[PDB]
């Protein structure tokens, strides 16, 4: 009567979904991550604050707009907020601050320093009309645009606003037919579905905005408009050595993403569905064909995969969601998202603490009505016989975890390995990660289940006691987080030796 | 290469995650009912003609507003609409026309006599501190204003929620077993008005319980008898009683509008999928409602989140998906039927059959009945040999009814003579009704002939099929039979 | 409930399904395995062939390496007598397969003192000679063997073993002469006429279709015999000289593969693909193979028989101290249940209907084991797996074979009523293995024979003439098997039978299934 | 992946993993299946024992139907001499469990001639007097005939059948007197000294402990057996009967219940709960049901003691023949396979041991057959459906047992290490059927020898003194386990290992997972 557990029961999915209870209350710990784009709305140390105690988890900077003092600023205003709760190491969480680039997004020029369907507009490369846009004269940063479309190319602008057809192709410009009507402003982004883009997939202006990543210290890397794995590994080269730990989630917006999906997904570390532009690059009624299917295979391979854009787009002006917007949150979670993402709902809405709010509750309650049975089993039965000592601890963990219906699984780590090795067979219990690392303590929020907790203990002399006192720290907090209490079961993970690489032992302790 | 068919052969439910393409094309055929609320924007003979093309299926009057005369008007319009193609029975389509009630809906009165106060969070309000309410019958119990803005909490109220309150708005009593009638006298009305105006459903409101549907059933009388109920699930105690009250109704509605406000919004994706699986085993139809593509109301286009939404509710199992506010009122009510029947036709496909039809089967029970066995023979069949359609005679429906419950993925063809048994056979996801208007035959072997041919016509006019595909046929084996017994497998001529 | 072991059917799981396992369950009347009888001195008379009948008997197996083409002539019309005894009732007829068993590429020992029946004890630690003298070739007693191949020296060494009938007696080669040899028992035991010679590991280089075959499978087509035990099949080649040899009369006759040795098991699924059926011949597989090794082979083919689709039978030691004794081990008992249970079409017994004691005993117990281990199998997997395992098909008969077994389970129906005149309908239907009876209605005599094969396939032979009106004609034959289903046991009025039958006259057009209460 | 049958191991349907057995993948060295053989004349020397433990004799059976205690006593000491002659080397040493059986509600017959080793033939048709008349008591042969069943002539009528040796001889009473009956033999055969009488369908109230059990049974607690096969219990009350003879003193040792009739299968639920253990004791229960139903018993019971977790031995004929000849027959071969493949923690020999010509071959078949079929089973379905029909739990060893058993299958490790004091914890790993052996160590030398009634567990006895530091213990015993595989072959350098230890030393908080590659 409690964590749709008389559903976890059933023999069936289909008796599965008839046993789901509106009245079996749901866990305290929320296991799918929270990712918040930050904005004019959610910029504030005050509105930060009250973000982190509403669930978020990830702050997320768009680089497609804003200066290195803007975005630096904004990096400044998450750690001082979420620097406010470091008082308290038990309550404390870690907040994970994302870099999404650019890429190589087309963008239109100035206006004058309406369209209507049927009219003829002309697409100008020439500079001089940058910023003399108009009716008749649209002006893009695409120079190369007439190399890769034709007379039967179809041009979005504005989020997928105006739909425009080229009828004839120049050398130097293109003549089009509004099909559409419609209101065009300054700056905005322009798709060219099934086109064969030239665009870098690291220009120079991505250059220097992962360079200044790399400098202020941020935990991830949303890569935009990600191709090929040729994409990714560009990324990664640029990030260099200083950036080597930064997680780079490539980011599928396009049908050649989705096409060479499988190359992307192994170079990268993780994927977002990026769900605004591939709803305009591909028919919007087979969105949720590739988001099933990245999900699927994200978990498959055991790589984190975010859902995101639009999850609670009402929100933006409405204090409360529609129907549709929490079944979108709630199937993202059971489909196997590991983290959910706000964009203008956080950035630049009404309602940015009561969209945060919304996706935490819908998140707690679609966790519970996961059908863990088929899941774990499809999981380990899809995931290879390895030798790998620490793969094998964590399906044992995961395997315990469900027998005893434990509280938490505790994982000590330094790198977050182990904690995702576990995080990726899905158990129901939060997988609680101590770690004296910052970094992976902040990471950890891309992987779900995985609470983080950032030991500032010193180093124990005895390595054994150390060991002890991170353990003795994790159920302090799952305690006072009410995850768990004592008398209840509680697994274990530690390593034979100091160092990363060496996790091998599981306990099935009671909590002291 | 083609409606995710690599997908569904995949041994586990998450290889066939991992293998949905966005480059199979789905088959021409669309299973789920897509039900449209008429209303000023949807109201015209030209406007209904339209929709009838774009996929409408059933045309819902919600008689929580209107008269009897606007409610008569939308009727005559829609059977003109819908007879202008009965002249030609081969490409005429069937469209039933459901009567959503008003039902025991609490009331507010009119501000100061007339036609806004401002409450403020914590204030008391017992005009602005008084409120009357037309329910005339605990502390902390929680009242909710005009479709859940204004939330109140019992004190001995306090306003927990602030905003603008208007006259005569909706009131909600979450938890609370409300002991209204389940049809009043205007109901009552409503559903005499609906026999007289031979509608072929009822979506009841508020159904609370077992006997709701017995009495909503009574006042439908003789010629209303085989008039289905759907009972709208729309509070906590419909929830909690819900397997009584399917047993005794013959369809379901998810009414997600009203029961987001009755239970934490956060919950409603869990009764959702509880009430559609609990429909799915026992064999009954269940609507999707409200919201689903609520953004289309002002744009051309939806939400990602919308698109999920109607997805997700076919992959559910619903048999039909519901339009309110976008059909009745919104700008662009055609754009709104065609992205559900696109997104349907896309999510039907992705349907794991390997899995749905195995534990349909499982809890089907074993029984006697001989069209029980040849319904789910004729569907086994269809997934043998990819059958481009399954033929049913049919003259109640219940046959082709005991076929789409276990939900082939090959659309239903069901030739009736009978008008209502046709228009109420949306009900079912797969079920396209056609009615055969041809006289009696006399040799009954040549009737039987006279309707599968026609069967065969309408699917080749659709694109479901052409000459030389297979489909599966079921009629009976003599005349007067009474049962469909028999299942031939046959090329289409 | 509470009846064919129905309780332990609706289990989730097979473990459960074997918790449920009820001993106070009693089985229908209808049992589906087929049963194959050897024939010998004990089960030769027509007297004792009208028993075998009435005990289960379904198919007579002929081994054509012992015996003369006049001593099987009489032997098949003793079959055919005990057979058509029971034709004045073509309700309770039964039809009677018989079987070619082939010489093939075996060794094979002579006469026992001029018979075919004599034995002698040959005793632990004694001298034997094996002689390639043609004197000795009806001769052969404790101490002279003659065997019939003629390059056994070339392939023996000293020390080397050599085993007799089927393993059981072995023996060391001591001496090795240029045309003989003299070997010494190591254990002892009792020797018979014309047994088999088993040389492990020797590469023995005899035909596959020697020249005694050529005259025994064209004895076989002249005498209308229904199917061939080819022995000794190695591979795939060995299967298309059988066909040719039974040539165009012979084309309808089921060729039944004979697993026996390690090239059999790893060219297997090439054989398979050849083959009308196989048999898991495990006399002679359990010698050329580890013992231990055996019920893996056994396993492995009756599971990519039942996959294909293919005839698979269990063969050779199920019942075999029932050769002395009236009632079987309990690992014979076992034997027969397991048989069943991973999925063979047919059971057969050698020794104990040839030869022994209590040849009725023996066909009636294997008829009592079947009926209880087919109530025991868990159709809810096995179904399931057969159908996913199938291939998504193009011909009407198939969807409507495995709709109409779906349609059986899911109103546990009497029987499924299928019209055929070659088979193929009823065959497709036992191929997906339902639970009920496939009662195959045949105006052809070697179908209804060769139906015994298929597991399930309860034939029954009309004789009534053809009927002028199509349609009456067809109910004319599925009234034939309601009266069948009836007198049997099967089924009663009230009850629901699937009825299979087809759209024109003519073989190839079974596409139409129905679901009748019995009238 | 070519071998223990891995390939197969990965089917996604129990067909496909029939399909993909091979005879040409070799299993690995580890045999799970324990095997209990009976000691008689043939098996009773010490040099005959020491043979019988390096062919695989695990447990030694002895039935205390003729001779002294004195005479049972020299029967243990030659058990245990045999036994201890390995422990100079404590590497291979292999502990052997003694296993004492029950008279109980047994009718049995006397000596014949005099001797418990003599024979006499019966021949079918000719007349057998049953006396009650002690004077024959010892006095036997073929036309007298002394039981110890007082009360027959009550029981029995003219027509009744009397069964003697597990169903070998039938009788049909000819004649009754107040103190005799003459019977006709039905089927001749061979008759020993104090056989087993079965009389169907009578109602015999014998007590489930005779006078004779009770003097045995505390003989046996104070030679320090470690079981019990307690005849034809049928009900719960009669296994608390038989553990309160065994009283306080022999309170730890295992009684493992026999069910050899209609009530005890019918009543198998109480009596499992009651008892250790289960014997699926075939030679009696093959005679008193149906032989028919006797797998549906076997799979029954195997199946709900695999549920519960309580070891289930299948017993009696399993390599029947070879008690006369050195290779078994294929139904034998077979019903060994089976018998694993169901689920049965033990096989066990009897005559095959007891009183054969080949009690070696015998034991080594057992080993051969049982290890083929180990790597045969379809482990992704077993340990899916034993973890469904097994309940969520709270004991912090339940979950480690099944999360070890889960990181075994995962990385294919070579066996899990279980330090254990009662055997509970590595009971509890074998109650999920690993693949990997489980090596269970112990200071316990009654729980090395009780272990061997689980599958999967292969105790070693640690002889070496307690460490002070006992990290150091541990360490010890753990790598005492490597020390063992590695010389058995079991795993070599980079295979991977499973180590169940608790968190300090104690008893019942077996809670500690470590995953090790092999030194
Ligand atoms: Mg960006
Ligand atoms: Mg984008
Ligand atoms: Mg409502
Ligand atoms: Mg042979
Ligand atoms: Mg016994």
């Known amino acids: 009567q409690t964590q749709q557990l008389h559903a976890a029961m059933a023999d069936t999915f289909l008796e599965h979904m008839c046993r789901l209870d509106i009245d079996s209350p749901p866990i305290t710990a929320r296991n799918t991550g929270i990712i918040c784009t930050i904005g004019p709305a959610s910029r504030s140390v005050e509105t930060l604050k009250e973000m982190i105690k509403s669930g978020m988890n990830v702050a997320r900077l768009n680089f497609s707009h804003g200066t290195h003092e803007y975005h630096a600023e904004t990096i400044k205003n998450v750690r001082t907020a979420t620097e406010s709760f470091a008082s308290d190491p038990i309550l404390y969480r870690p907040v994970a601050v994302a870099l999404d680039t650019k890429g190589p997004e087309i963008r239109t020029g100035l206006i004058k320093g309406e369209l209507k369907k049927g009219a003829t507009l002309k697409i100008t490369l020439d500079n001089a009309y940058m910023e003399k846009c108009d009716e008749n004269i649209l002006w893009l940063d695409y120079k190369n645009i007439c190399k890769v479309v034709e007379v039967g190319s179809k041009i979005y602008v504005d989020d997928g606003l105006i739909s425009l057809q080229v009828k004839q192709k120049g050398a130097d410009f293109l003549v089009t037919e509004v099909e559409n009507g419609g209101s065009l402003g300054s700056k905005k982004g322009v798709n060219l579905p099934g086109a ?23 935990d991830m890397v949303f890569a935009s408009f990600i191709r ?18 930064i997680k780079i989630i490539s980011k599928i917006e396009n049908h050649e993403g989705v096409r060479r999906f499988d190359e992307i997904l192994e170079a990268s570390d993780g994927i977002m569905v990026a769900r605004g532009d591939l709803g305009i690059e591909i028919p919007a009624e087979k969105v949720f064909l590739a988001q099933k ?52 709902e956080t950035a630049k809405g009404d309602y940015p603490l009561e969209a945060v709010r919304m996706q935490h509750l819908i998140a707690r ?36 975890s469900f027998k005893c219906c434990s509280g938490a699984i505790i994982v000590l780590t330094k790198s977050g390995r182990s904690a995702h090795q576990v995080a990726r067979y899905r158990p129901r219990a939060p997988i609680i990660a101590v770690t004296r690392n910052p970094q992976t303590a902040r990471q950890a929020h891309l992987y779900r289940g995985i609470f983080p907790v950032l030991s500032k203990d010193p180093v124990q002399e005895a ?3 150390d060991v002890d006192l991170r353990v003795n720290f994790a159920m302090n907090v799952g305690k006072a987080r009410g995850f768990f209490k004592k008398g209840d079961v509680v697994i274990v993970l530690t390593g034979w030796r100091p160092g990363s690489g060496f996790t091998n032992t599981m306990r099935v302790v009671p909590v002291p």
């Not at 064969?196 to 941020?218: H, N, R, T």
């Not at 090929?228 to 730990?245: C, I, P």
């Not at 679609?366 to 793969?391: C, G, N, V, W």
């Open 228 to 245: 090929k794995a040729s994409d990714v590994h560009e990324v990664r080269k640029v990030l260099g050595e200083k950036g080597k730990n």
């Open 196 to 218: 064969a883009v030239d665009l870098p997939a690291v220009s120079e202006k991505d250059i220097q905005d992962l360079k200044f990543g790399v400098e202020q210290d941020v």
């Open 365 to 400: 309650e679609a966790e519970a009505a996961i059908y863990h049975l088929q899941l774990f089993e499809e999981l380990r039965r899809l995931a290879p016989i390895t030798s790998d000592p620490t793969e094998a601890t964590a399906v044992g963990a995961v395997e315990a």
């Open 293 to 344: 299917m990245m999900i699927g295979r994200c978990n498959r391979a055991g790589k984190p995969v975010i859902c995101a854009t639009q999850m609670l787009e009402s929100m933006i002006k409405k204090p409360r969601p529609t129907r549709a917007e929490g079944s979108d949150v709630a199937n993202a979670v059971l489909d196997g998202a590991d983290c959910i993402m706000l964009s203008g």
């Open 463 to 465: 390595w054994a006691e």
